[model samples]
Structures are given as structure tokens and as C-alpha cells.
Target chain A: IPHTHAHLVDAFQALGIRAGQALMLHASVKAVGAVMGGPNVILQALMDALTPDGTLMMYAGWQDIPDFIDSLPDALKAVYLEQHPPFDPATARAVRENSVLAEFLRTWPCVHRSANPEASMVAVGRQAALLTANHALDYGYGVESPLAKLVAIEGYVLMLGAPLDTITLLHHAEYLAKMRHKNVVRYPCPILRDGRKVWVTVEDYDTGDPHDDYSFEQIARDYVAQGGGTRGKVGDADAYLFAAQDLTRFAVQWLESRFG
Target chain B: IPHTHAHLVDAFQALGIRAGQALMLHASVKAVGAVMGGPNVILQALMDALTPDGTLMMYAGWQDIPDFIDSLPDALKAVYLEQHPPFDPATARAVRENSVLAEFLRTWPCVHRSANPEASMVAVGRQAALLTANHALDYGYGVESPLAKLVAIEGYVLMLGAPLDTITLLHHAEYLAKMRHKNVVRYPCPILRDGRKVWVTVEDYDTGDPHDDYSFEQIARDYVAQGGGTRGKVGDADAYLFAAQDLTRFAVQWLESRFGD
Candidate 1:
């Protein structure tokens, strides 16, 4: 069957996504199988399913950060650093080049963007402004970001055929939990501050560490086992809808017990 | 070719492991291929190569620590804790499910064992007593252990087919370096303290974080590239001999440049 806006509406309904419910969606459009109107249609259906009152959020990590800056030759680096493009949320694209949904959703009319250059988040709908406002410098995923707002409003995290590792909500939990060996990363990047390009230092946790033994899968599996979320099929994709508040609360307890 | 004592001696000689040099060895016996007189013959050959003056060291961490104590049921854990045997260096075996050589070498005559229950090291040769004398309760790999002693004497580390991650010497560098996010791991174990069994808190870095992005390979490769070690074949296995002082000195500088103060 050709997946269209109507089919997505049916799928979202089956996944228990209702009107006025805020959702942070991490999706792989190709995993949803062939859609009639493609990725944009899926986005349209999501908006239609939630109606005008609900907000939809997506992570828009900066795509322009140069790779292997440390290993580059000294001469090439000097030229490259000076010529580096400042992160402009209005013009910058998400890191997911293959997945068009995040880019399409972020550019949709009247979407709100968080201020953090590297960890920017984009949202659309009624709660978009409030959720994305005042994103902090230090802990990008903590109480200041849209993730905290999602938890505050008892929102839902809709994973559309994405693996367990795509759960950025867990970083919010990591930031909340007190750990002694919290990994840190430091680097300099150019960003547009007050209409002028300025270089800023990024000193944050090593979230990209593949060996971070802090397992989010364990908590997610426990959440489902404890009957805290709904699971269903969306097109040909395996989908899950978890209440943000329930996940945050469960993760905080798990992180404290395990790491503390 | 069938490996013998003569072949190992020749291999060690080629890799720059000299007599009177202290060495920390991490090895895989099977990886060394077939030996004519088995593991004991290989040990004999290493002893012959280093002569009686050279000190040979191997990590002899307690073999009795049960696997996965965290997930065990509370009732079962209480019984297990009570029945847990105290770490007896004289009687306790090295963890040999993975490395048979460590156990064989630790049991050899004239071997001096460190006192730390969790992070014990056994050494054989002239400096055995000095190197393994007083391993501290905290920072078992720091100044208290044989690692620091190895560095102090400008010894050598011989890796016989073991990967770079098993480079236990790097932990000494980690202990010496100043990094705020330096990982720490803590657990409790029963040991004989002052002739009586008592539970002592074991605390150290999270050296087992396999996802650690800091690559020891990078440091080692750079060391070899700069001509700080010898690489050759020992039996069918690949071998590397690195100067303890040079490796530790390089690691301290590398860690500081990357991780900052």
C-alpha cells in the first residue's frame, strides 16, 4: 500500500498520538517505506494528527563543523579556521543529510529554534516558542532546553523506527544525575552573536563516546515492561510513543541508583 | 617451526630485552604458537634471556572475585559475601582463564607478590622485593606498584601478541596525569588485613571503559615511529619491546596536550 498523509494519520492514531499532545520525534523517513507524498507528507500527517495545539520537536545539530581539525596540517588549519562559517540557525541544516524530515520540519512556517549553536533544537506549533526559549550554554540538554519543557508538559517522545541510541532524552537524564567521572570535551567554533561572527569555546560532556556504559536501552525496556508507553506500527516502521515525564522520572531514578 | 627456549632467547635478544633490565610482560601463551617444552620452557627461556639480574613482572590480580556480583539476588549475595575467601597471595592463583602465563610465572620460585588484594603484581629477579614491596590501598597502579618501579629503573615492557588496550603501563601515566574527568571505579572485597579477614574499599580509575576515545595506539605508534622501541616476531606471535621511561614520559605529554590541565 502507498503510504500517504491519510495512512500516516491512521498510523499516528494507532500509535496513540492525540490532539494537544507535545511530541519530540526522532525519525528515519526511509524506514517508513514508500510514501505517496514522500517525507514532507509524513510531516504533514504528523501536524494533522496532533492538530494546531500540539508541538513537534526535532534535534538540529550543526552540520557545518569541520572534521579532523586536530590532525590537519598547521598551515591548512589557519586558513580553514579563519574561513569557517558561523553557525546560523536560520540558514544551518541538520546533521542528517539523508533524512529530509528534520530539515523539512525545521523550515516549516513559524518554527522556533533554540539558541545553542551545536545542540540547536527546532520545534513547530503552539508550545514551540516556550519550549525552545532560553536554551542554556553549559548543559545544553538540561532544564533550559526543550527536553525539560517536554517533561514539564508531560509530552511524548515518538521514535519512528529509530534505534534505542537515538534517544537524546536520556542525555537530559545524564545531565540531571550527579556523576563524578562526567566526561568533558573542549573545542572552539564560530557562531553569530549579535549580528557579528564570534568564536566560542565548547566544553561539554563526551556524549559521543561509544563506550558510555550508561545504557538507555535498559531503562527503555524497563519502561515498556512497566506499561509506561504504547508501541505500534507506523507504515512499515516499528514505532514507540513514550510519555516524556514518565521516561525522565524513570531515567532519573535509574541513573541515581546505577551511577550514584 | 617448533618454538623452543633457544628460539625465545633469540627473539628477546632481537627485540632489545637485555640482561639486568626489568620488564612488565602481558602475553597470550597460545598466541606464541607451539612451544617444544610448553609454558614452563617458555618461562625458562625468558628467565635465561633476562638472566638472574633482570626482574620480570606480571599482574596477578585475585582470581576469586566472582563475576557479576551486582545483579545477584540479595539473599544469595549475603551468603556469597560471608563465604568469600580472603585474598591469600601465597595460595591465590592469578586470573588464568584468559592468561595462563601470568599464573605460571607468579607461581615460579623467588617471585615477590604485592600486598594489594585487588591489584596484586608478582615479580621475579633481583629487584622483585623492591618493586613488589608496598602497593598502596589507593591508586594501585601509581607510585606504590611495580609500574612506578619499572619507570624508576628505566625498564622495558614486552607485549607478546596482546593488544594495545592491555597496556597496563598506561594506567600509571593516567595516575600521574591531571585531568578533572579522570574516571574512578570503587568496589568492596574481603582481604587479610593484619592477619584477619576484613572488607576493604577498592577505589581506582575506570580503566575498563572500552569506549574511552583516548587511544593508547596513537601514543605507541608515534613512539615506534620516533624509534623508541623494537618490533619483531616471537614464535609465530608479533612482539614489541618499549622503554618504560620513554613510554611513560611520552604518555604524560600526550595526555596533557589533549586533555588539558
Candidate 2:
């Protein structure tokens, strides 16, 4: 039998999401065993567990841009870049249908979403306006990103049935890590400039390489060994709860040892 | 006789700041008659009135830079701009104590200050950590600044014993106004770059100009006349409390009518 939202709440409480605490969630709903109501049940459980005081946050990636354009033929790339509609964080949907849970949160009532098109994030709670406002241009994942804000406030991250490599908090650590000649990836994306559509090159971390190039499993294991994160079970999936500030700090030290 | 901190709380409540609300304050300490303990008492009163849930914000402008160096002789200007210690929002004091309350707030335990060198703001409360992060360079007072965040959350502004010209929210409106050749002033300021002091040309609105040049009086009056702000007394001075969101919207419209194509 599929687990219900009530069961999911029980699991989340066990994972240490106390009322009034802020959390960023990365979930693979399909991997969380079966929920009778599917993603809706999972999302409702998260909300019910947090109640009105606690805020639940999720990343709302503009998948339509890089996701759709990257796979196009070489000849269509430039044309699509120039002619593609301006990326509107307010209306742009999540990257893949599998991230329907993120989309649900994006449209949730009273949710505050950051303005960055590619790396937008949405939050709901007492601090939603503070956490999701004024994302920077060049370093969307750096000190200016929502992830950084979450860490600054001693927030937590929940990986519900999701792999460690899928953790976005690592990107914030990447920004803090000091290294020379660090790779910078740039691609054209349309944005509203002076009330007109203009194609501008957006720059960010180089995650284009294969899984082995930017893998985080060893570091994740080390973090667990160093007493940095808590592990539990949600439904049938293994869940991990990590303090965002501690995780980023660990990643910085690890990156310094390995890359620096 | 001076008004006590408790009296200040009475004035704040009368001015419409309830528990758990976010607020940005602009004050002329001397103009607010006399406080029992001066700025300290006024600051404490505000903190006590707002409680822990309410966030108090104030602009913490770097007084030494741009303000002092801009008009200096060219020979001395370069030397000061290069040799002056990098602006540290955490330790640096507000410009000439123009914002005495802001300076007090910045030094308060656990207060959060933005990274912007020229127009940084400080906040102390639940949302302080969020509002004071990631301020941009080019448009320090625009969508990315604490002013915009204040408007986004429907926060309030308290102009205590200060004139309409003292309101900083107008600067954010100037950034939003669509106009041709909107005046932009540029000056070099020192900031920490790569762990060392470096000269960076800071650009922003021309507030140094006189009232006829960039005044916000008419717009502010219109806001009050339209019932967007409330009037009251704080201490012995005439105080005004405004809805930041409404003020920003009105400034945008006012600027549009005057500057729009």
C-alpha cells in the first residue's frame, strides 16, 4: 500500500524538521516508495509538517532554456538563443516533469520566488521575502544565492530519496572554494532588457562534465563519518538531513584539500 | 526634560508599528526633541517596542568616502581614494552620523549589514539575515537593495522628525523610473578587492543637488494626501509613517509622468 501524507509527515518529523525551522528540500518523489496521492501528497505532508511558521523552499530551474536548447542541432543553437523568449522566473516552468513538486511550490499561495531566471528559488514562511529576494547575476549560487541565505540563517537541507550528488548546496561551496583558473561555463539566454528581449550570455559553475568529473559521493560519506549529517528513512527511501552551513563549510575544506 | 525609552515606545505604537512588523527608520535625533538617554534610549525603545520578531532596518552609508573625497583636489583625491582603508560595513561607521540610529543598529549584536560599500543597510530581527545579503553594485538602491525588499514584504517606513527629503526610498524609485539620460553621478571609493583595498567608481542618484533638481516633496505630499501614509508624533517632533510599497509605486508613477516617453 502507498504511504499517505500523514505517514510522510511522521517521517519528516523523525528527520528533525521542527516547527519554525527553515528547510530546502531535494526529493525524488518516485523513489519515496508509493504515496497514495503522489507528489501532491508528499508536498502536502511537507507543508503540514512545517505548519504556518516554518518555511519550505525548493529550486525552480528554468529547464526550458538549457534543457531544451542544449540538445538542439548546432545550426539551431544560435537562432534559438537569439529568438528564444525572455526567461521570466514568474511564469517559467520547472526543468523536467519529474520536478513537478517544485512547480507546485512555485505556484503555492504567498510563496516568494527569486528573480534569477536560470537559478530561481521559491520559499514560503516568515522569512520568505528575505530569502528569495534579489538573486545576483554572475554568481547565482554564491553569497548572493538563496542557498547562501539559507545557510546564513542556519537552515537545513533534506534529501528525500535523492542522491548526494544532487545536492545544490555544493554549488555554494564551489563559490567559496579558492582555486585558480576555475572553469567558467557561459551560454546565451534571453532576458528583458530595457523592456525588450535581449540575448545575454549567462555564466555559472561548469556542471557540463560527466558524473565522475564533479562527483560528491566520497565527500558525502566523509561528511557522514565526520558527524555532519543525520540519516533516517522516509517511506521506503533513505533520507538525509544536513545543516546547510556545516555542509558548505565541509565542502569548502574538502575542495581546498583536493582541488586547491 | 527628555523623553524616556518607554515614551518612545508609546510614540512608535501610535505611529503604527505593531509586533512582528518589518520597519525602516530615518530619524533626526536632535529634531525629535530630547530623549531621556539620547540616541541610546531611543534605539533601546525601538528595540523593546518591536520585540524580537519585528525587524528594524536603517541605511548605513559610508561617511568617509564619496562624501568627503568627491570634492577634494585631484592631487589629494587619488591618494585618499587609494590609501583610505577599505570600507567595512561591519565596523565602518555611518556617514557623519547622519543616521545615528543606523550606526547604533550596526553595532548591535547579531545585526546584519549588506555588502554594498556605498549604500549598505543594516537590519536586526528575524528577516535581518535575508534582507541584508547580496546587494548589487550598479543599482545599489534598485530592485536588489534592502529598499526593494522592504517594499516586497509590505514593510513600513518611519521618518521621525525628518523632512520628506530625508526619505531614502525615493532613490529606489529613481532607479525604477524609465527616463532618457537620467542623471548618474560617479565617484571613486575604496573597497576590499581580492583581500586588498582597491578603487572602484561608485555610481548612483544625484542627491547632492538641491531640491529643485531632484526633490521628492511633491510626491511625498501626494502620498500623504492620497492616504498612503499616516501622520503622528514621536517625542516632540512631527512624525510620519508610510507604507513602503505604496511610496515606491507612487514615486514610480510620479517619475513616469515627468520623465516617461
Candidate 3:
């Protein structure tokens, strides 16, 4: 069967993914469990691949409802957050307590995303607190964005099954430069850092028109295209490491003609 | 044969897309043209729908080679734009002239992209002269950015045929956002006011980085999954338009779980 955790670790090693190297990962535990090895095992194996010094990064963002509501304006504040799959609050809370999985990525010098502080054991893990994103986006808009700074200075996306799934990277680009500006202020999440969970007010600018929304057709097309279709796999996903240099290449070759 | 442009116009019209509205369009000429009619024709028809009042926008940016060479700490400029696809003078010219193509959009306000002018438009009839592309990133190290502002201000996007072919709209979400206090800068486009082209710079920001760019992906996926595949012909390509509201609805639904209300 497709080995879940061990398989991923083996593949990373085979592909020459080393320690200290930054990696970005996206996953659906449900989807991963569908494979031979469950998502849990898969994650474990990923941690193993960072044997020595490599960094393993994955998004463990929490959707804090109360915080979101309090931060929003009266009109938008009234908006209710939907809960379906559950917020994995246990895991989220444990992240602060240094849960095995939580410990994987709570400490690192990452500016935008959380790093794996637990790397000392399985691998260096980092914690990108859900609340931190709010603060970074809030005060760091335009030229002074922590997220943008992370992406520009230290972040190098490591696409697993997610491919170029998150455009968070793009926001980093936008932080560097922009076309038109809009106003969108938000409050930061209250989190327990080092022990106490305090609230930090931050802002995030929704660049797209508030009127404009998402389209499913556009989503699917890119999924199949960037996700690499049939070739997409766990170990395989981490195999592709797009460095800063690669982005430069894409800009010159593709972005230049297409948008330039 | 098929009316790709007609189909897109029909979809837009059905959803209340009217004239005088300014729309930021991200497209792949190839995908739109692959329809029953043709993309070029569909685009023409779209222009027709917005004639006299509305404006249709597209990215027409160029690399500031001189600036690139001059700005970078002599050590970085060469290495910076080295692999970059130098902007062709011809392409820049084409983007200007082609702003009002097939007659309908000829008189519309266009933004010609350049080093200083943020939102630039290719000179009239000079659409073919625009640059091919650059290899910096999705955007360059940040140069050639007028396109980002257009996507901000909640710019209306008209995607035909191709689904997220050009993630231009998303760029703003991921990048320009004055409210977020991010990299917010603005400039004007040199346009033909009366008979001569003039610069119209302004201040604005739109990070274009909302919903992780993945948000666009989510919306596009559900559109086709939800049967928005409805197709028609314009000129040479088949076309489709995910109404503003519908796209928003889908985005809200998809992102609601990930982000929240």
C-alpha cells in the first residue's frame, strides 16, 4: 500500500530534502486517511524526513470564532462563523502545551508561518498561531508586512499535495507592491504565547473587491493543473522545492509575457 | 459558428453586468478562443456591452529595464533582471492601441503599464506592442505592478473561457490592501485624454492576496462542479462568466469553513 508516514520520510530522503531547509505543506487528514496509511502516519513520516536540521511546516490555523466576531464591525461582526468538521481545539490547545504533534512546529524564527520547534525530537517544528496572522496582517500592511517579510526574506513554499494551493504567497507579493488600495481593518487573535494568551490587534487587507467572490470552475481548473493531477502524492509533493531562484525564473519566463 | 463571446455577454447580462462598469479581466486568449465562436469576438461583444460608459481592463505592464539597471545595488540589478524577459517596445505599443479592440472598447479608459505610471494602457492600436512576460515571480521582484491596483478596490473581474488562467485578480487579494497597511503604492496611467497620451497617477493599494490565492481555486472548482459549465460562442472562442454574486457566493461558502464569517 502507499505508505503514509514512513513512505513520506523515505521519499524526502530519496529526493534529497535535508534539514534546516524550509518546507510548506497542505493536507486533508480525511483525504490522507483514505490512502493506505492514515494522515497521522503521513505527518509523522514528514517529521522524520527533517532528520538532523530540516524544517517541516504545515498550517495548523485555528478558526477562533469569538475573536473573529469581537474584531469585526457591527455589521460584519454579526456574521456567524460556521463549524462543521470541528476546530481540532484539542490539537490547537496542545500546540501551546507542546503536544507531540503540536510540538512539531511551534518555535522558529519564521515571520509569516509557524516553524516546527519540535524538530529537536522528530524535527524542528514551528507554530504559526492562528492569532498571530491577525496581528501581522493588521499592522504590517503595505511595505511593512511581517507575512510579506517572511515570504520575501525567509519563506520558500514547499508544496505537498496542496501544490500552489494557498495564494498567501501572492499576498506577500502584493505586500511588496500594489495597484489600487482598499481599507480593511481587523483585530488580532488572543493567543497564549509562552503561557498567556493575549490579544494583539492586527489588520488584513482583502485585495479583491468586497463585491467579487470566488468561482468553483476557476478553483477546479487550477487544482488539477497545479496539483499535478495523477502524479500528486505525499512524498512526491515534498519532492518539489521551489526556491527564490525558481520564482525568479517563473517571473521572467511566464509572468513576464503573460502579465508583463 | 459558436458564439463564445455572445455566450459570455449573455451570462454577464443575465447577471446584471451593465455598461459603464469598470471590470478587471484575467484571461487566457487561448482558452476563451477555444470555444464555439472565438475569444476575440467574445471580448468584442463584452466591450459592446460596456460601450460609452463602462471600461474593460487587462494587465499591460512592462519591466522598467533602465530602472532595474539603475535601482538595484549595482551588484543585484544585473542578476535581478538577468533571466527576466525584457519588455519588448513593440508589445508595450500594442497594449495601448488594442485597448479598444474590434471597435466597441476603442474609446474606453485604458491604463498603460510602465515604470512610473502604475496603471498603464497600451497606446491605441498599439495592443500588439505590449511585452510578452517577465520571469521574476508571479509579479516581478515588485517592479511592473500597475496590474495589482486594478485588481484592488474590489475591481470587477470578467473571466471568460479560461478559468483562473491569469491569477491577476488574486494578486491584489494576496498583495495590495490599503486597509491592511501593506505595500500600498499607486501611480497613474498615461492615456489619451483628448488627442495625446497623459499620465494619471493616483494613490491606492490592493495586495490582491486574499484567501490564499487558493480561494480563487476553490471558487473555480465549485463553479464547474456546480454546473456553471454553461457555454456559448463569442467570436472564435467559447465563453463563460461566473456572475459577480455567484462567484462571491461560492467563495463565501467555500472559505466560510476555512476562514469564517
Give the number of the best model, judged by DockQ: 2
Residue pairs with backbone atoms closer than 3 Å in model 1 (clashes): A211-B211
lDDT tens per residue, model 3, B1-261: 444566656655654457665555555555543455444565556666766455565555432422223323433543543443333433332233222231223233453333322233332212212321222222331334433333222235555544553434434333322121233333223333455444332333333345333446665666668875344543344445444334444444555445442
Off by over 4 Å in 2: A1-11, A32-38, A67-74, A179-182, A208-214, A233-237, B1-22, B30-36, B48-55, B60-156, B180-204, B209-215, B225-243
**Candidate 1, superposed: residue stretches over 4 Å from native:** A1-260, B66-71, B210-212
Better of 1 and 2 by TM-score: 2
For the record, the alpha-carbon RMSD of candidate 1 to the native fold, in angstroms, is 14.5
RMSD of each: 14.5, 4.8, 20.4
Interface RMSD of each: 13.5, 2.6, 13.7
For each candidate in turn, the TM-score is 0.50, 0.78, 0.33
After superposition, the stretches of candidate 3 with alpha carbons farther than 4 Å from their true spots are A2-4, A14-16, A30-37, A65-155, A188-200, A207-232, A235-241, A248-260, B1-261
When sorted by lDDT, best at the front, the candidate numbers are 1, 2, 3
Higher-scoring candidate on DockQ, 2 or 3: 2
Worst 10 residues of 2 chain A by lDDT: A206-215
lDDT of 1 at B100: 85
lDDT of 1 by residue, A1-260 (tens): 67988989988988899999899998888789999978888888998899999888888877786533534544455566788888888898877742568888779999999888667888899999988999875568877887888899999999898776688898888877754346545456677888988865555555675223667777788878888788999998999999888888888887777665
